[PDB]
Every structure is written in C-alpha cells, then in structure tokens.
C-alpha cells in the first residue's frame with residue numbers, strides 16, 4: 001500500500017484543494033456526507049490512498065488545512081464538501097501574514113507550525129506505508145508561500161526518505177494581483193529548489209489562455225482554473241489507485257524525470273479539452289490526444305516549449321488502448337520534433353497506461369514536461385526582483401520582521417545558479 | 433518424474449505467466465478452479481501431468497509457480513481475477529512501493545527482505561518435486577524489479593541448487609521504442625546476472641513481435657495480451673517434449689547441450705513459424721517445408737537483428753503435430769542448400785531435430801488460427817552481438833555526463849559498478865566477435 005498525506009496552505013491552495021477533493025470524491029463515488037455510493041468495485045480497492053475509514057463505514061480525506069485567516073476556513077466549511085473533512089485538522093490562526101513572506105515564515109507562522117506538524121505527525125504515524133506528501137499553495141502570496149516553505153523544510157527534516165510533491169502557482173508577466181510578488185516568489189523558489197523532489201509549476205495566465213482559446217469560456221472564473229489543476233492532480237496519481245497494463249509510481253516518475261537533483265521543476269498539461277459543442281466534430285483517439293498533448297498552447301506554465309529543449313517528458317494515459325499505438329506515437333513525436341529534445345538522452349519520453357479512465361470520458365491523459373524553457377519564468381522574476389532590490393522598494397516591511405539583505409542576496413544568487421544550470425543544455429552541438 | 437519450477441518476477445513476468453498458465457490449463461483440460469472434469473469423464477489415464485501441476489488428495493491441481501512483484505497491483509489483479517482459486521494463496525507480494533525503475537532499489541535495499549521468503553517457498557516446492565529438471569524465470573530488462581530482484585534470486589539459486597538448469601525468458605530493450613529513460617542502465621547492469629548464473633537466456637524484442645502481429649496476424653493495434661500469448665506459445669513449444677509422447681523427444685539437458693557450444697555464448701534467438709490469422713490460414717498449405725523456410729526469414733525473427741549480418745552457430749527445430757521425419761530431413765537439406773544462410777565451419781552438423789505428436793492448442797478469443805503442424809526454431813547465432821551493441825551505445829551517451837546516477841548511488845550502489853558492467857558487456861561482445869572468425 002502507498003498512501004499520500006495532503007496539505008493545503010493559503011487561499012489559493014485551499015481553493016484548489018477543495019476542488020481537488022470534490023474531483024477525487026466524485027471519482028471514487030464518495031458522497032458529500034462521507035458514505036460510499038459507487039458502482040464499480042475498483043473504487044474501494046485503493047480508497048486508503050487518499051482516505052481513512054471511520055467507524056460508520058464513512059471515509060474522511062487525509063487532508064490538513066492550514067491558513068492564518070479564518071475567512072478561508074469558514075468558506076471551505078460553508079461549502080458543498082465542508083463536512084467531509086475532519087474538524088480537528090482545521091489548523092488556523094489570526095492576523096494573517098498580509099502578503100509578507102517574513103511574517104509567514106518567521107514571525108506568525110513559527111507559532112502555528114508546531115500545531116500543523118503535530119497534526120501531520122499524528123496523521124502520518126497512522127499510515128501503513130507512507131509514500132509522500134503533496135502541498136498546494138501560491139508562491140506570490142503571503143501566509144501560503146512562507147508557511148508552505150517552512151512546512152516543507154520541517155517535514156523534509158522529519159521524513160527524508162519519502163517523496164515530496166508541490167503544486168505551485170507562481171506570478172505571471174501580465175496578470176499581477178499583489179505588488180510584492182517578486183520578493184515572495186524569489187524566497188519561495190529558494191526554499192523550494194533547496195528542499196523538494198518534485199514541483200509542478202502552474203500559472204494563471206496559461207490557464208486563462210486555455211480557458212479563452214481551447215475551452216471557449218466567455219467568463220472563466222477561479223473555479224475553472226481549480227478544475228484544470230484538479231484534473232492534472234488526479235492524472236498524476238491515477239496509477240497508484242487503479243490497475244493498468246504498465247504501472248507508474250510517483251517515485252518512478254521522480255527517477256525518470258529528474259536527471260540532476262536541482263532540476264525538478266515541471267510543466268503540467270492535460271488532454272482532451274474540447275469546449276463543448278465540438279465533441280461531435282472531433283474524433284477521440286490516441287493520435288488526437290498526443291497532438292493536443294505536445295501543442296504549445298496546452299501547457300499550464302506559460303512557457304513556449306519551442307524556446308528550449310525537452311530534458312524529459314512523461315505521458316500518463318487512462319483508458320483502454322493499444323501499447324503499439326502509444327509507443328509509435330511517442331516515437332513519431334520524438335522523430336518529427338528532433339530539434340526540441342536533448343541528443344544525449346535517447347528516448348527521453350516516459351509512458352504509463354491505466355485501464356480506468358475518468359467517469360465521463362472514454363480516454364484521457366496527462367503530461368509532465370521538463371524543458372529548459374522554464375528558465376524564462378525564473379529570469380523574469382529575477383529581473384523584477386532586481387528592479388525593487390536596487391532601490392529597496394518595499395524592503396523595510398521584511399527587515400522589521402527579522403530579515404537582512406544577505407538573505408535576499410543569497411536567494412537571488414541561488415536563482416541565478418538555477419537559471420544557469422537550466423541554460424547549460426539549451427544550445428545544440430556537444431560531444432561524441 | 434520430470435518437472436520444472438516457473439518463476440515470474442516483475443509486471444512483465446506476471447503478465448506472461450498469466451498467458452502461460454491460461455495456455456497450460458487449456459492444454460491439460462484443467463478448469464480455472466483447479467478441478468479436472470476429465471478425471472470423472474474418463475476414469476483413467478494421465479492428464480494433469482506432473483511437469484507443471486501438482487495433484488492433491490481432493491482432486492485439485494495446483495501449479496508449480498512463484499509469482500513475485502513489489503507492486504501490489506499486478507498480483508492483486510490475479511488474486512481477484514478468474515484464476516484466483518488456481519494458485520496457492522502464498523503469492524509473495526511486498527506491501528511497499530516498487531523499484532521505481534532503479535536497479536539499486538530492487539537489488540540492495542528494497543529487493544531484500546522478501547528474498548528470504550521467496551527462497552523459502554522455492555525450497556518448499558523443490559522438496560515437493562521428484563527429479564526436478566530446472567527453473568524457468570520470466571523477467572524483463574529495463575525494469576527495476578526485473579533487474580535487481582532477478583539478480584538476487586538468480587545468485588541465490590545458483591548458490592543453493594547449482595546443478596539444475598536455469599532458463600531465462602526476458603524482454604530486451606528495443607532499438608527505438610521504450611517506456612522508460614533509464615532502461616540502458618538496468619539492462620547493462622543485468623549483464624552479470626544473465627552471463628554468470630543463467631545457463632540459457634532467451635531474449636524477445638517488443639518491436640519484432642509488433643511487426644509480426646501487424647504483418648502476419650493483420651492486427652493493426654496489438655497490445656501486451658498478444659505478445660504474452662505468443663511468448664506463451666514459444667514456451668509451450670519448448671516444454672512440450674517433457675509432457676507428450678513423440679517420435680524424437682528433446683529433454684532440457686540435451687536441449688541445452690546442443691545449443692551452447694561454449695559457456696559464455698548461451699543467448700539464442702527464438703522464432704515461431706505458423707503465425708497466421710484465420711483468414712490467411714486458408715489458401716496456404718502450411719506444409720513442413722513452408723514453415724521450415726519461414727523460420728529463417730529475417731522478417732519473422734523475434735528480435736530486431738538481421739541473421740544475414742552474422743553466422744548461424746547452432747540451431748534446434750522442435751516440431752509439433754502431424755510431422756514425419758522425412759519432410760524434416762528434406763527441409764533441412766533444402767536449407768543447407770541455400771547460401772544466404774551461413775553456418776560456421778566448425779559445426780558441420782548444425783541442426784538438432786525434435787518431434788512431438790501433440791498439436792498446438794488455440795486459446796479461446798485468441799488470434800492464432802488452428803494449424804495441424806507447427807515448429808519453433810531456437811538458433812544460436814552471432815547476429816545478437818549487434819543487438820547488444822546498439823544498447824551499449826545508448827549507455828555511453830547517458831554515462832558521459834553521469835545523468836540519472838544520483839538516484840542509483842543514493843541506494844547503496846557504487847559509481848564504479850557502471851564501468852565494470854560496461855567492461856563486462858564489452859567482453860561478451862568481443863567473444864561473439866572472436867567465435868565467428870572461421871579457422872585457417
């Protein structure tokens with residue numbers, strides 16, 4: 001058995017986690033009250049991956065909810081699936097960080113971190129064989145970024161063996177919602193690249209582009225973005241819960257996607273996306289899934305993959321299909337797009353297949369890319385960071401909470417080392 | 433009594449075992465629940481042959497199998513499937529994560545613990561047998577479990593039993609398509625296992641079977657079920673001699689003697705002639721000469737390697753069904769007359785012949801047509817070196833920059849083991865090169 005402990009920090013993390021739990025409960029046929037009303041027998045085969053069984057044949061998610069503002073907690077409780085969660089796991093305080101990373105990491109979060117770690121320890125010790133943790137939050141925010149980094153560091157100290165995943169929403173070129181996004185993003189990226197095994201980069205701009213262009217939604221909201229992120233989250237972990245012709249664990253993905261320890265930032269994607277009213281025209285098949293997979297516009301990280309090279313990608317398909325077809329399609333993608341893959345990793349495409357598709361789709365698939373183009377995002381943040389650190393634009397609010405210019409300087413230096421690392425394998429021509 | 437112990441390590445091994453045991457149960461008339469209605473129908477004879485199935489007092493027959501895999505899912509599919517009542521409940525599942533396509537995890541850290549229990553069950557089975565012949569292990573190169581745990585199991589079996597024959601059936605990495613980026617590392621690290629402890633290792637390529645299914649069986653979208661069924665047919669053709677009477681019976685000992693000229697060249701190719709669909713089953717005689725010629729075609733080989741780029745060291749033809757020795761001799765003479773098939777000068781005989789009366793069976797819902805005759809050709813040739821060299825190149829291109837090495841060395845494995853394995857595989861290649869050069 002391999003079970004995951006889920007943690008949610010910040011407003012964005014809490015919203016995405018609520019939608020994700022809704023999606024998972026629908027997939028496993030769990031009612032909002034916790035009872036089971038499914039049809040297939042495979043739903044309860046691996047329910048313990050994400051749930052704990054209670055006395056009255058109920059199932060409680062293994063979620064841990066964290067924030068420094070009661071408003072988000074009240075929003076989750078006053079919702080369609082508010083009653084599913086264990087009330088004792090609602091760990092929260094007051095006087096939130098207020099978009100200040102120093103408050104989230106050092107001043108305010110340092111007190112609630114003990115309670116959150118106590119709940120994490122209690123939940124983890126009850127597992128039969130823990131697999132890893134997954135944390136959902138936003139890097140450009142306040143309490144979310146700071147306390148997420150703090151919890152990641154503490155848990156990594158506590159449980160070095162287990163795999164760590166993170167679903168991070170990061171700033172954007174155009175879509176800006178807070179003024180101090182570069183500071184929080186820089187410090188969060190420092191802590192993340194230090195102390196994680198996997199990190200899926202999400203962007204609001206890319207999700208809005210997918211909504212407007214692919215899904216043709218006239219009025220997208222945060223619900224649709226959370227829906228897309230939840231679909232990706234379910235796709236990543238589909239293989240642990242259901243049987244397949246070729247299984248794939250999170251550890252296997254980490255081994256096959258991380259060539260060097262510091263390169264663990266990923267570009268997620270999902271297929272199919274049809275917009276409704278065009279499903280009748282489109283023919284669903286593995287070539288169509290792959291073509292939508294490798295399209296530049298389908299990525300959620302707001303990076304053009306054609307501005308770099310793919311270090312390594314992984315496709316996880318769900319639904320009945322032929323292995324010859326998927327292997328051939330991956331080969332054609334590699335051969336035709338010969339200039340977008342590194343020449344020193346032959347067959348840098350991982351393939352996994354599962355026989356249990358989503359509830360309403362005959363076939364589905366998810367994509368995890370690791371390419372050099374992600375450097376752009378970091379570079380962009382670095383530029384903005386410099387534009388405020390040269391003059392100390394908003395610095396005092398941090399230094400009043402127990403910080404110093406040295407910490408910012410080393411964070412920026414670490415980001416520069418990261419972007420140089422990524423840039424090394426972009427130019428072609430090298431070796432035997 | 434003649435019997436062999438079948439072992440299935442990894443997902444590929446377990447799936448191939450599912451196909452193999454389906455075919456065996458259909459061949460011997462054993463129901464999925466283990467009861468044989470033929471006993472009460474006939475009241476005599478021998479149908480549940482002791483080669484694969486052991487009989488109990490209650491009339492229930494249990495196979496001599498040991499399924500092993502670190503993933504609970506693959507074996508849990510079996511334990512809740514149609515054949516849940518066939519196998520013994522002791523199914524050797526590690527209730528933990530998998531090797532994660534890591535040789536070190538499957539050999540050093542996680543592959544242990546369960547190894548003692550697996551060897552205990554194998555010891556119990558071996559005590560159960562009388563006149564045990566050998567072991568048939570099914571694994572797959574490129575997988576963490578199938579590499580590391582296979583290494584552990586083969587090593588310990590060599591230490592414990594030693595003299596018994598050890599046949600390996602493995603899926604080698606293909607030249608082009610594969611489902612993992614670290615396949616070269618595991619494949620090259622498995623060279624010590626496949627060369628020191630295994631007495632005869634057979635290798636099959638997925639692309640070769642895909643092409644065979646596409647061209648012959650007219651299956652445009654094959655899947656692993658068809659590949660596993662073909663492998664099951666191959667193993668049944670190999671082991672049919674130990675079960676059914678025949679004019680020329682080929683035991684495993686004599687099978688190994690005439691196919692391994694030297695100790696470190698025990699890596700023969702395999703091929704099956706009458707691979708044909710129901711529609712194309714008509715319009716063709718499928719005589720002995722046709723199948724014998726079809727064996728040697730490069731198109732029908734089960735590994736992506738051209739026999740015309742090397743020399744045929746030795747060959748063994750195992751026929752099943754309505755086959756007479758005269759036609760086999762005529763076909764062998766015709767093949768010797770052909771010049772495209774080159775034989776090494778130091779093997780004037782070349783061919784071994786075996787015949788069995790039992791014709792092949794057809795799985796319900798399968799693709800192979802019902803054929804009176806069949807043959808399996810198992811040939812030791814030097815072309816396989818090329819199939820090993822391509823993979824070797826990939827390993828170098830991945831080892832120059834030490835890519836993906838930290839995962840391996842973080843599980844107790846040393847860096848230098850990669851280079852040692854590389855030098856070993858380099859040797860096997862040179863030897864296949866040296867054994868060719870004709871004498872002067």
Ligand SMILES: CC(=O)O[C@H]1C(=O)[C@@]2(C)[C@H]([C@H](OC(=O)c3ccccc3)[C@]3(O)C[C@H](OC(=O)[C@H](O)[C@@H](NC(=O)c4ccccc4)c4ccccc4)C(C)=C1C3(C)C)[C@]1(OC(C)=O)CO[C@@H]1C[C@@H]2O
Nearest residue numbers: 022023026224227228231234272273274275276358359360
């Ligand atoms: C005509 C038809 O077949 O109906 C589809 C549909 O029209 C389309 C357009 C659906 C529809 O999705 C959307 O409209 C949408 C909007 C914003 C963000 C994401 C989706 C659909 O709503 C979504 C819904 O999807 C599911 O049921 C999946 O299992 C999905 N479920 C959920 O997201 C979910 C919804 C409510 C409560 C709990 C879960 C899923 C996908 C991956 C992993 C787990 C679950 C389906 C069948 C449809 C509708 C209803 C119109 C699409 O969604 C998916 C991922 O299935 C959008 O493009 C796909 C492809 C479909 O053709």
Ligand SMILES: Nc1nc2c(ncn2[C@@H]2O[C@H](COP(=O)(O)OP(=O)(O)OP(=O)(O)O)[C@@H](O)[C@H]2O)c(=O)[nH]1
Nearest residue numbers: 442443444447530531532533572575576577656659
């Ligand atoms: N022909 C065939 N090959 C298979 C099948 N299942 C898996 N494989 C092969 O197995 C390789 C990787 O899977 P395995 O070697 O079985 O790895 P594993 O046994 O699951 O062990 P882990 O890597 O730890 O999960 C792939 O390259 C596949 O080609 C199958 O059903 N039929």
Ligand SMILES: Nc1nc2c(ncn2[C@@H]2O[C@H](COP(=O)(O)OP(=O)(O)O)[C@@H](O)[C@H]2O)c(=O)[nH]1
Nearest residue numbers: 010011012015138141142143144145177222225
């Ligand atoms: N996709 C998505 N993003 C959100 C949502 N709510 C907030 N965000 C993003 O989160 C950022 C603000 O961070 P915030 O959650 O307030 O930080 P916190 O106060 O520490 O939790 C903004 O840039 C938003 O784009 C949501 O429901 N969905």
Ligand SMILES: [Mg+2]
Nearest residue numbers: 443503530577
């Ligand atoms: Mg496995």
